[PDB]
């Protein structure tokens, strides 16, 4: 083994920072990115505490589809990255980079990436110590003839150089199963046997109308636990709103895939944190997002979605490392072996732990994410682990998995009910993680959680998550319900028929909208109410270390009921929020 160029694990998670090449400007002789970020400017803006855990991911987007274009653009940017000087210290501090080398099956009618040879990749790895990895993304919809053969070469060239091959894919058309050899293309399967320690496999939740979120995430977790990948994670994509045909928040009717650039702006900001929790809580450590202009920012400035949700969530997973592989293994009661493509794909988990076919969220944390691997793989390395002796490994074709009812009856016997209420909640150590799982319906949810004898009841509106940690002196609270008002994008349309017919915002139009109406002059959402009730409390709790999104919260209200040893906490806010409550139990 060659020394790894960087660590990627629970203590060293990874936030990929995408920069998409502007092909139109490249034709004019300029080296720029859609949305106006610059490589140096973006890197500089990244908070210093995050720099060790973030990597610039270059993407060739609409560069000319012919030989030389992607090489030219990439070499220019690798040179900029390599030569970077920190203006504070005057020292050359090479910017870490990942190159997108494969996308859309590398078809010459789809991407300039077609003309990036494995030879050239090897050359860049050898020239640039700051090239930490290469990235393949979104070929599920165009599963090219030699995709597995090329993936094998990408993994091997990365291992040769101590870099990572990172592959983001969704299980549409059995993609994950095919990648590992379901249909007889076994080159990547064999490559993985040798080189898995240099592989990161991620979901890509874009094609949301096909409902493969839960099954793909289950595979990513299972591949990791079974040593088919070094780590895992997810690319969470606001374009899911477009794929599923949604429009104005909470509105009636479906507009189909008709208003792309309005649609990728509309997903509630806090809902990205809800999606990301599914990665974190299940031991994933790699995060990436689209659309980049909304999820990260423009013009070397952080979008509010980035500043108030993603940055804060990512800081949380650095401060509180995800459960280790050993820990997740010890917690796993059931491990599925087989092809979800043969068992309804995403439907497998509907009314088990998802509330509908088309969602990136879960309705219960009772089973967390049940890990799986495709039928083509073996569970040999899984069973060899010291930590896997108590797992029931089950074929997906087992009677226990034959129907929705059978799945719950089987799982319920192994995963006890550990909270009450129709809401998402999952517990790790002394922390309850809670969210409202409604996607596009304005419905409050309630749950009853316990820390031993201490009872905590919560009431959450949609697009609200909380993390509640029992500390020696009380409770630490992290709350995020940040959701700005996107109604202006859907102006002039009273119903779905009118919305579908709106003039296209366009890619350039949406970038402009971000600049003029999101980065500044933001239409903030209304403050909304969260209730927390604690029962089993000695005296009126005190509040400490209160902070959150500027101008986004009223002072929390505490109402202590002496006779009933309980407090009702009422919060009115729209943003991220943090505080401690100090109290003793009664
Ligand atoms: C031939 C064809 O139409 N192929 C489609 C894929 O490109 C789709 O992939 C992504 O889908 C999104 C819609 O759900 C969207 O089209 C996205 O590209 C757009 O957004 C990115 C940033 O998020 C860039 O700005 C692109 O320039 C822009 N393109 C357009 C036409 O508006 C697609 O993602 C990009 O392309 C894929 C191939 C990868 O390279 C990604 O990394 C890129 O971000 C796919 C969705 O399921 O559907 C296919 O039909």
XYZ file of C-alpha atoms and ligand atoms in Angstrom:
636
model
C 0.000 0.000 0.000
C 1.109 3.527 -0.923
C 0.627 6.145 1.819
C -2.827 7.776 1.572
C -2.720 11.402 0.434
C -5.346 12.316 3.043
C -7.498 10.619 5.657
C -11.245 10.161 5.132
C -13.060 8.649 8.126
C -15.349 9.572 11.041
C -12.718 11.818 12.675
C -11.631 13.156 9.286
C -14.868 13.579 7.303
C -14.919 15.131 3.853
C -16.964 17.973 2.416
C -16.565 18.167 -1.361
C -16.646 21.745 -2.688
C -17.797 21.669 -6.347
C -16.646 24.187 -8.985
C -18.229 23.748 -12.419
C -16.294 24.907 -15.517
C -17.900 27.640 -17.587
C -17.602 26.263 -21.146
C -18.978 29.402 -22.818
C -16.269 31.554 -21.243
C -13.622 28.920 -21.987
C -14.494 29.412 -25.667
C -13.738 33.117 -25.098
C -10.316 32.221 -23.640
C -11.261 32.656 -19.974
C -10.879 30.095 -17.167
C -13.928 30.541 -14.956
C -16.701 28.719 -13.082
C -20.494 28.951 -13.363
C -21.683 31.177 -10.520
C -18.522 33.275 -10.411
C -16.508 31.502 -7.700
C -12.749 31.413 -8.336
C -10.580 28.542 -7.144
C -8.331 30.752 -4.998
C -11.179 32.997 -3.803
C -13.360 30.065 -2.828
C -10.581 28.289 -0.956
C -9.659 31.495 0.887
C -13.295 31.982 2.010
C -13.523 28.446 3.467
C -13.392 28.893 7.269
C -9.977 27.864 8.586
C -11.430 25.205 10.927
C -13.045 23.555 7.850
C -10.020 23.704 5.530
C -8.590 20.367 6.781
C -11.846 18.610 5.910
C -12.797 20.240 2.594
C -11.571 19.589 -0.918
C -12.252 21.542 -4.137
C -14.009 19.249 -6.634
C -13.537 20.475 -10.223
C -16.269 19.488 -12.719
C -15.927 20.003 -16.471
C -19.673 20.846 -16.955
C -20.139 22.324 -20.467
C -16.509 22.532 -21.626
C -16.236 21.784 -25.397
C -16.778 18.103 -26.271
C -13.488 17.434 -28.038
C -9.968 16.398 -27.244
C -7.856 18.716 -25.112
C -10.514 20.993 -23.587
C -10.883 19.301 -20.182
C -7.118 18.659 -19.966
C -6.406 22.344 -20.703
C -8.938 23.621 -18.115
C -7.895 21.083 -15.473
C -4.114 21.691 -15.890
C -4.759 25.449 -15.579
C -6.653 24.904 -12.290
C -4.192 22.332 -10.876
C -1.441 24.914 -11.526
C -3.462 27.591 -9.661
C -4.128 25.130 -6.810
C -0.471 24.048 -6.567
C 0.908 27.577 -6.512
C -1.486 28.991 -3.909
C 0.129 31.229 -1.276
C -1.612 31.933 2.051
C -1.691 35.771 2.291
C -1.656 35.627 6.114
C 1.595 33.590 6.352
C 3.136 34.062 2.882
C 3.652 30.271 2.645
C 2.863 28.128 -0.437
C -0.033 25.972 0.749
C -1.259 23.814 -2.166
C -5.037 23.627 -2.376
C -6.380 20.067 -2.216
C -8.255 19.044 -5.362
C -10.463 16.266 -6.679
C -11.018 15.992 -10.462
C -14.298 14.830 -11.987
C -13.033 12.327 -14.549
C -16.140 10.310 -15.488
C -19.807 11.350 -15.895
C -22.730 10.568 -18.246
C -20.953 7.331 -19.301
C -18.181 9.591 -20.683
C -20.101 9.648 -23.943
C -18.439 12.039 -26.423
C -21.845 13.619 -27.078
C -22.324 14.314 -23.320
C -19.034 15.379 -21.725
C -15.558 16.785 -22.301
C -14.453 14.246 -19.626
C -14.398 11.603 -22.380
C -10.957 12.967 -23.342
C -9.201 12.411 -20.001
C -7.094 9.283 -20.325
C -6.053 7.078 -17.423
C -2.491 7.830 -18.572
C -3.127 11.580 -18.100
C -4.708 10.955 -14.684
C -1.582 9.050 -13.544
C 0.563 11.932 -14.822
C -1.459 14.485 -12.810
C -1.332 12.402 -9.642
C 2.466 12.225 -10.057
C 2.825 15.967 -10.831
C 0.443 17.246 -8.142
C 0.721 16.019 -4.573
C -2.381 18.130 -3.858
C -4.507 15.993 -6.216
C -6.182 13.854 -3.569
C -8.667 11.925 -5.685
C -10.826 11.515 -8.761
C -14.599 11.479 -9.040
C -17.108 9.608 -11.180
C -20.717 10.815 -11.009
C -24.161 10.182 -12.480
C -23.922 7.478 -15.126
C -26.942 5.483 -13.768
C -29.011 6.868 -16.677
C -26.377 6.008 -19.342
C -24.683 2.807 -18.252
C -21.934 2.723 -20.903
C -20.562 -0.615 -22.161
C -17.184 -0.435 -20.411
C -18.136 1.566 -17.306
C -17.038 -1.216 -14.920
C -13.744 -1.725 -16.811
C -12.997 2.022 -16.592
C -14.015 2.187 -12.903
C -11.468 -0.607 -12.231
C -8.773 1.512 -13.929
C -9.758 4.639 -11.947
C -9.595 2.721 -8.660
C -6.242 1.141 -9.543
C -4.643 4.410 -10.685
C -5.816 6.056 -7.455
C -4.450 3.221 -5.265
C -1.134 3.353 -7.214
C -0.790 7.000 -6.160
C -2.361 6.947 -2.696
C -5.398 8.908 -3.889
C -9.087 8.064 -3.706
C -11.532 7.027 -6.381
C -14.927 8.427 -5.413
C -18.039 7.193 -7.229
C -21.499 8.743 -6.747
C -24.354 6.769 -8.266
C -28.032 5.964 -7.544
C -29.484 2.444 -7.924
C -31.583 3.370 -10.994
C -31.618 0.519 -13.508
C -29.739 -1.665 -10.972
C -26.628 0.574 -11.285
C -25.035 -0.348 -7.947
C -25.651 -4.052 -8.544
C -24.218 -3.856 -12.078
C -21.145 -1.936 -10.854
C -20.213 -4.916 -8.688
C -20.839 -7.480 -11.433
C -24.549 -8.432 -11.463
C -24.639 -8.646 -15.283
C -21.251 -10.319 -15.657
C -19.037 -7.222 -15.937
C -16.745 -8.104 -13.062
C -13.684 -5.875 -13.582
C -14.661 -3.445 -10.828
C -15.614 -6.268 -8.466
C -12.078 -7.719 -8.862
C -10.493 -4.275 -8.536
C -12.375 -3.721 -5.253
C -11.025 -7.026 -3.828
C -7.532 -5.492 -4.096
C -8.089 -1.781 -3.732
C -11.178 -1.159 -1.574
C -9.179 0.953 0.908
C -8.891 3.617 -1.808
C -12.605 3.608 -2.783
C -15.378 5.943 -1.585
C -18.888 5.067 -2.793
C -21.666 7.651 -2.454
C -25.346 7.812 -3.285
C -26.579 10.513 -5.681
C -30.166 11.336 -4.837
C -30.993 13.393 -7.988
C -33.299 10.952 -9.863
C -35.914 11.193 -7.121
C -39.016 10.252 -9.165
C -37.629 6.699 -9.285
C -37.547 6.460 -5.468
C -34.192 4.649 -5.018
C -33.027 6.744 -2.028
C -33.473 4.140 0.711
C -32.131 1.188 -1.269
C -29.099 3.061 -2.572
C -28.264 4.366 0.920
C -28.709 0.845 2.320
C -26.173 -0.416 -0.258
C -23.684 2.363 0.505
C -23.793 1.493 4.216
C -23.592 -2.260 3.554
C -20.705 -1.989 1.082
C -18.779 -0.071 3.745
C -19.561 -2.452 6.622
C -18.557 -5.423 4.443
C -15.200 -3.868 3.351
C -16.185 -3.278 -0.282
C -15.527 0.460 0.178
C -13.256 2.407 2.563
C -15.968 4.950 3.457
C -19.300 6.118 2.093
C -21.488 9.159 1.856
C -24.016 10.942 -0.280
C -24.524 13.644 -2.816
C -27.761 15.438 -1.856
C -29.378 17.314 -4.686
C -31.953 20.105 -4.694
C -32.785 19.120 -8.325
C -34.885 16.376 -6.673
C -37.662 19.036 -6.564
C -37.528 19.246 -10.378
C -37.399 15.431 -10.919
C -40.523 14.966 -8.746
C -42.455 17.848 -10.361
C -42.962 19.975 -7.250
C -43.400 23.742 -7.333
C -44.337 26.344 -4.704
C -43.917 25.018 -1.146
C -47.042 23.180 0.113
C -48.948 23.955 -3.107
C -51.398 21.540 -4.746
C -50.685 19.882 -8.117
C -47.634 18.615 -9.977
C -45.916 20.559 -12.785
C -43.606 17.737 -13.933
C -40.060 18.421 -15.099
C -41.005 21.786 -16.534
C -39.404 24.614 -14.547
C -35.967 23.281 -13.686
C -34.238 26.436 -12.564
C -37.116 27.594 -10.333
C -37.443 24.077 -8.991
C -33.828 23.454 -7.847
C -34.095 26.619 -5.734
C -37.269 25.638 -3.854
C -36.237 22.767 -1.534
C -36.319 24.046 2.093
C -32.780 24.778 3.327
C -33.120 22.784 6.566
C -34.310 19.727 4.610
C -30.720 19.308 3.321
C -29.694 18.847 6.986
C -32.439 16.234 7.375
C -31.027 14.338 4.338
C -27.471 14.723 5.641
C -28.430 13.196 9.023
C -29.136 9.944 7.205
C -25.458 9.882 6.189
C -24.053 10.883 9.603
C -26.257 8.661 11.802
C -25.277 5.623 9.768
C -21.514 6.157 9.814
C -21.109 7.920 6.442
C -18.465 10.674 6.317
C -18.461 12.143 2.777
C -20.837 14.960 1.791
C -21.526 16.717 -1.515
C -24.411 18.785 -2.841
C -26.092 20.211 -5.911
C -27.207 22.640 -7.223
C -23.895 24.303 -6.139
C -25.114 27.887 -6.590
C -27.844 27.364 -3.979
C -26.168 24.827 -1.708
C -22.738 26.493 -1.522
C -22.913 29.978 -2.997
C -21.816 32.288 -5.795
C -19.033 34.863 -6.301
C -16.896 33.408 -3.477
C -19.743 34.124 -1.006
C -21.580 31.516 1.085
C -25.284 31.086 0.396
C -27.477 31.129 3.523
C -28.234 27.459 2.947
C -24.482 26.870 3.211
C -23.870 29.244 6.134
C -26.898 28.394 8.294
C -27.352 24.684 7.534
C -24.534 22.873 5.744
C -21.576 24.618 7.424
C -23.117 24.196 10.854
C -24.031 20.543 10.221
C -20.549 19.773 8.930
C -18.972 21.443 11.962
C -21.206 19.206 14.119
C -19.942 15.979 12.455
C -16.332 17.125 12.976
C -16.974 17.909 16.669
C -18.937 14.692 17.142
C -17.429 12.006 14.865
C -19.930 9.682 13.179
C -20.218 6.189 14.704
C -17.191 4.111 13.727
C -17.452 1.054 11.509
C -16.919 -1.102 14.628
C -19.760 0.692 16.394
C -22.186 0.485 13.448
C -21.304 -3.244 13.123
C -22.050 -3.855 16.845
C -25.417 -2.057 16.424
C -26.425 -3.935 13.231
C -29.003 -6.648 13.879
C -29.957 -7.475 10.265
C -27.810 -7.339 7.139
C -29.497 -7.931 3.784
C -27.766 -9.864 0.987
C -29.384 -9.539 -2.445
C -30.755 -7.261 -5.158
C -33.281 -4.581 -4.267
C -33.981 -4.285 -8.034
C -35.791 -7.661 -7.760
C -37.861 -6.619 -4.716
C -39.503 -3.321 -5.691
C -36.418 -1.103 -5.305
C -37.447 1.841 -3.065
C -40.870 0.308 -2.430
C -39.010 -2.212 -0.215
C -38.860 0.335 2.602
C -42.136 2.240 2.068
C -44.254 1.963 5.243
C -41.302 0.223 6.865
C -39.107 3.270 7.467
C -40.087 5.665 4.621
C -43.500 7.339 4.315
C -43.671 7.348 0.495
C -41.873 6.195 -2.653
C -40.387 9.599 -3.485
C -38.506 10.893 -0.438
C -34.907 11.313 0.806
C -36.129 11.134 4.423
C -37.137 8.472 6.934
C -40.253 8.240 9.084
C -38.628 6.204 11.867
C -35.085 5.703 13.186
C -36.086 2.390 14.863
C -34.098 0.277 12.380
C -31.843 3.169 11.393
C -30.703 2.254 7.845
C -30.697 -1.521 7.289
C -27.397 -2.290 5.472
C -27.292 -4.440 2.341
C -25.033 -5.581 -0.458
C -26.024 -6.735 -3.982
C -26.448 -10.506 -4.544
C -23.326 -10.682 -6.726
C -21.086 -9.925 -3.717
C -20.088 -12.176 -0.811
C -20.412 -11.557 2.927
C -17.001 -13.251 3.589
C -15.150 -10.116 4.806
C -18.203 -9.089 6.820
C -18.173 -12.379 8.763
C -14.387 -12.165 9.314
C -14.828 -9.043 11.443
C -14.603 -9.375 15.226
C -17.616 -7.010 15.538
C -20.067 -8.904 13.278
C -20.743 -12.052 15.358
C -24.283 -10.962 16.380
C -25.597 -9.867 12.956
C -28.313 -11.919 11.224
C -27.240 -12.059 7.577
C -30.354 -12.691 5.486
C -31.005 -13.256 1.777
C -33.353 -10.628 0.343
C -35.424 -13.539 -1.020
C -36.126 -14.717 2.589
C -39.794 -15.080 3.664
C -39.104 -12.352 6.244
C -38.696 -9.796 3.432
C -41.499 -10.983 1.131
C -43.946 -8.162 1.967
C -44.186 -4.867 3.863
C -45.937 -6.645 6.776
C -43.405 -9.474 6.949
C -40.535 -6.952 6.953
C -41.895 -5.033 9.940
C -42.842 -8.155 11.880
C -39.343 -9.549 11.451
C -37.491 -6.267 12.052
C -39.656 -5.308 15.064
C -38.542 -8.438 16.909
C -34.872 -7.388 16.553
C -35.138 -3.611 16.726
C -37.210 -2.649 19.759
C -39.466 0.393 19.709
C -37.484 3.084 21.553
C -39.662 6.214 21.372
C -43.267 7.203 20.798
C -44.964 9.452 18.250
C -45.295 9.814 14.517
C -42.010 11.620 13.813
C -38.447 10.667 12.887
C -36.160 10.015 15.857
C -32.934 8.096 16.361
C -30.719 7.783 19.429
C -26.936 7.612 19.678
C -25.343 7.459 23.130
C -26.856 10.383 25.095
C -28.255 12.185 22.049
C -31.690 12.162 20.464
C -31.813 13.206 16.795
C -35.323 14.237 15.726
C -36.938 15.584 12.568
C -40.313 16.157 11.000
C -40.345 13.864 7.952
C -42.994 15.675 5.852
C -41.613 16.719 2.480
C -44.241 19.049 1.003
C -47.212 18.930 3.441
C -47.638 21.517 6.158
C -48.250 19.143 9.063
C -46.790 19.326 12.605
C -45.402 16.188 14.197
C -44.890 15.208 17.815
C -42.713 12.684 19.653
C -41.967 11.507 23.183
C -38.296 10.723 23.824
C -36.638 9.583 27.046
C -33.203 9.942 28.657
C -33.663 7.188 31.255
C -36.492 8.577 33.451
C -36.376 12.095 31.969
C -39.217 12.639 29.476
C -38.852 15.011 26.547
C -41.854 15.726 24.332
C -41.357 17.766 21.160
C -43.580 19.436 18.564
C -41.895 20.215 15.208
C -43.205 21.847 12.028
C -41.918 20.481 8.685
C -38.272 21.059 7.730
C -37.129 21.086 11.351
C -34.436 18.928 12.924
C -33.075 18.892 16.449
C -30.249 17.270 18.372
C -30.808 16.938 22.108
C -27.951 15.789 24.271
C -28.224 14.882 27.942
C -25.201 16.521 29.570
C -24.127 16.254 33.237
C -25.807 19.577 34.056
C -28.928 19.477 31.818
C -29.562 19.375 28.079
C -27.636 20.734 25.100
C -30.001 21.731 22.245
C -29.177 22.215 18.574
C -32.211 23.179 16.469
C -32.448 23.998 12.789
C -35.629 25.026 10.994
C -34.102 27.458 8.487
C -36.430 27.904 5.533
C -36.563 31.088 3.493
C -39.603 32.163 1.471
C -39.367 30.996 -2.149
C -42.859 32.176 -3.148
C -41.457 35.026 -5.270
C -40.130 32.419 -7.721
C -43.685 31.193 -8.239
C -45.269 34.660 -8.615
C -47.938 35.098 -11.317
C -49.054 31.471 -11.017
C -52.130 30.631 -8.922
C -52.118 26.898 -9.746
C -49.993 24.084 -11.253
C -51.291 24.723 -14.797
C -50.118 28.394 -14.648
C -46.839 27.438 -12.912
C -45.921 24.943 -15.645
C -46.413 27.777 -18.200
C -44.198 30.389 -16.482
C -41.312 31.715 -18.563
C -38.167 29.668 -17.927
C -35.993 31.232 -15.263
C -32.940 29.652 -17.027
C -29.548 28.687 -15.601
C -28.157 32.212 -15.938
C -31.438 33.589 -14.615
C -31.304 31.432 -11.495
C -27.660 32.438 -10.840
C -28.747 36.084 -11.186
C -31.698 35.452 -8.827
C -29.304 34.056 -6.233
C -27.082 37.163 -6.563
C -29.896 39.728 -6.408
C -32.489 38.051 -4.179
C -30.798 35.387 -2.032
C -27.241 36.561 -1.285
C -28.811 39.942 -0.577
C -32.337 41.270 -0.112
C -33.214 37.770 1.125
C -36.911 37.000 1.595
C -36.648 35.294 5.008
C -39.371 32.878 6.121
C -41.662 33.570 9.060
C -40.552 32.621 12.551
C -42.367 29.439 13.519
C -42.986 27.602 16.812
C -41.129 24.587 18.259
C -42.276 23.192 21.634
C -40.091 21.168 24.002
C -41.613 19.753 27.175
C -39.456 18.210 29.901
C -41.043 16.133 32.657
C -39.169 15.015 35.750
C -37.432 18.318 36.557
C -36.549 19.635 40.052
C -36.674 23.408 39.553
C -37.086 26.003 36.805
C -34.259 25.347 34.317
C -31.799 28.074 33.388
C -30.759 28.907 29.802
C -27.107 29.235 28.795
C -24.992 29.896 25.680
C -27.953 30.953 23.543
C -27.015 31.755 19.955
C -28.235 31.276 16.407
C -28.832 32.779 12.987
C -28.761 36.570 13.372
C -32.225 38.169 13.785
C -33.916 34.786 13.458
C -35.235 33.921 16.920
C -37.270 35.334 19.782
C -36.028 34.700 23.338
C -37.127 31.184 24.291
C -39.968 31.097 26.785
C -39.721 28.792 29.789
C -42.860 27.886 31.682
C -42.157 25.864 34.816
C -44.935 23.955 36.562
C -43.687 23.274 40.074
C -46.438 20.845 41.120
C -45.979 18.707 37.997
C -42.140 18.971 37.918
C -42.203 19.968 34.298
C -41.187 22.793 32.002
C -42.646 23.846 28.658
C -40.112 25.559 26.387
C -41.581 27.589 23.511
C -39.264 28.693 20.706
C -40.241 31.015 17.847
C -37.573 31.011 15.181
C -36.440 30.406 11.616
C -32.723 29.498 11.397
C -30.167 27.546 13.367
C -30.263 27.788 17.137
C -28.220 26.486 20.043
C -28.476 26.649 23.845
C -28.083 24.650 27.033
C -30.739 24.148 29.652
C -29.399 23.556 33.127
C -31.518 21.603 35.626
C -31.574 18.636 37.986
C -33.979 15.721 37.764
C -36.773 15.290 40.298
C -28.891 13.919 -21.513
C -29.552 14.331 -20.224
O -30.490 15.139 -20.218
N -29.054 13.787 -19.111
C -29.620 14.096 -17.802
C -28.540 14.316 -16.754
O -27.695 15.370 -17.166
C -29.195 14.597 -15.402
O -28.184 14.847 -14.426
C -28.440 15.995 -13.585
O -29.815 16.301 -13.556
C -30.266 17.562 -13.115
C -31.779 17.525 -13.259
O -32.326 16.633 -12.303
C -29.615 18.624 -13.989
O -29.887 18.469 -15.385
C -28.114 18.504 -13.738
O -27.432 19.423 -14.559
C -27.695 21.100 -14.391
O -27.212 21.430 -13.055
C -25.767 21.307 -12.847
C -25.451 21.798 -11.396
O -26.279 21.103 -10.436
C -25.048 22.086 -13.978
O -25.360 23.493 -13.867
C -25.451 21.592 -15.385
O -24.890 22.428 -16.395
C -26.961 21.722 -15.582
N -27.396 21.149 -16.881
C -28.546 21.538 -17.458
C -28.861 20.905 -18.829
O -29.344 22.337 -16.942
C -27.545 17.129 -14.076
O -26.295 16.995 -13.443
C -25.149 17.320 -14.266
O -24.932 16.362 -15.300
C -24.689 15.034 -14.864
C -24.547 14.151 -16.114
C -23.449 14.988 -13.970
O -22.289 15.328 -14.702
C -23.600 15.970 -12.813
O -22.427 16.011 -12.035
C -23.919 17.373 -13.340
O -24.159 18.233 -12.240
C -30.055 13.365 -15.042
C -30.777 13.479 -13.700
O -31.303 12.211 -13.326
O -31.022 13.140 -16.059
C -30.472 12.923 -17.349
O -31.534 12.783 -18.265
